[PDB]
Amino acid sequence: NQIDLNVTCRYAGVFHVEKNGRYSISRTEAADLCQAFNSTLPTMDQMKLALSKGFETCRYGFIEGNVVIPRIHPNAICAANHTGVYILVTSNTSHYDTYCFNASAPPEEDCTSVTDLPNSFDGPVTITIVNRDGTRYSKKGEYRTHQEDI
Ligand SMILES: Nc1cccc2c1CN(CCCOC1CCOCC1)CC2
């Protein structure tokens, strides 16, 4: 019973989380996952500020209200070469990665590793935070509050 959470640097508190190396998070699970990081889904304004501080990914993820990809540099295989906060308009499907916003993070780029999942609850799952530099932090717990996600 294992979940891996790959996390990015934070930019103005905003970061990206990918579950188990594939698009696999529902909107309800996304909210719960951010809550486990003492975080919330970012607003569009929070995401725009993060983008301005250097945040970009090549992955769709939830924010409050939309599914987006922040892009700084045009790349043909990331958000169809767009820059800015690219908003997904048309999709059949419901599972993506997520973004999260931590108000207590530093104001600009924080590329230190994440070494805690401070608001996980008691549970049976081995949850492993995986940083981009490979450093890991694991704990037994749960974060999902909706049965249809479990
Ligand atoms: N942040 C982090 C921490 C630990 C592991 C990983 C990450 C970030 N993942 C980046 C995934 C990028 O995939 C792109 C999307 C499709 O085009 C190829 C690149 C790759 C795996």
Side-chain angles (χ1 to χ4, degrees):
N1 202 345
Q2 171 87 58
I3 293 171
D4 287 22
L5 302 173
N6 300 332
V7 303
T8 65
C9 300
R10 280 66 66 214
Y11 287 86
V14 180
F15 59 109
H16 167 256
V17 187
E18 170 194 24
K19 179 185 180 192
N20 291 330
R22 61 196 171 261
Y23 287 125
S24 63
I25 308 170
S26 70
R27 172 74 172 60
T28 54
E29 185 163 346
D32 287 351
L33 184 51
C34 298
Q35 189 159 168
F37 288 105
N38 283 326
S39 293
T40 48
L41 283 288
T43 65
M44 179 62 79
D45 284 347
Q46 287 165 343
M47 178 59 84
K48 286 178 172 174
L49 191 68
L51 172 79
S52 81
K53 304 300 185 176
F55 192 40
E56 65 174 353
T57 78
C58 192
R59 299 283 290 180
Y60 290 116
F62 302 101
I63 61 168
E64 191 63 49
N66 282 285
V67 172
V68 305
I69 307 181
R71 291 304 303 164
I72 294 169
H73 313 274
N75 187 318
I77 68 172
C78 304
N81 213 52
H82 288 91
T83 70
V85 179
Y86 176 77
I87 300 168
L88 177 60
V89 177
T90 303
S91 176
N92 282 344
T93 57
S94 64
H95 283 47
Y96 301 99
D97 298 344
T98 197
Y99 300 95
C100 298
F101 168 66
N102 172 13
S104 301
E108 303 191 291
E109 178 184 68
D110 177 13
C111 280
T112 59
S113 50
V114 177
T115 53
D116 192 21
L117 185 63
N119 202 37
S120 60
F121 52 86
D122 179 83
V125 186
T126 299
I127 303 163
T128 302
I129 311 308
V130 185
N131 289 280
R132 184 62 283 196
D133 72 2
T135 61
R136 287 179 182 236
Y137 167 80
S138 297
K139 70 192 296 197
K140 192 187 64 71
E142 178 56 86
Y143 61 87
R144 295 163 296 175
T145 71
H146 292 91
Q147 189 51 55
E148 71 271 20
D149 291 325
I150 305 162

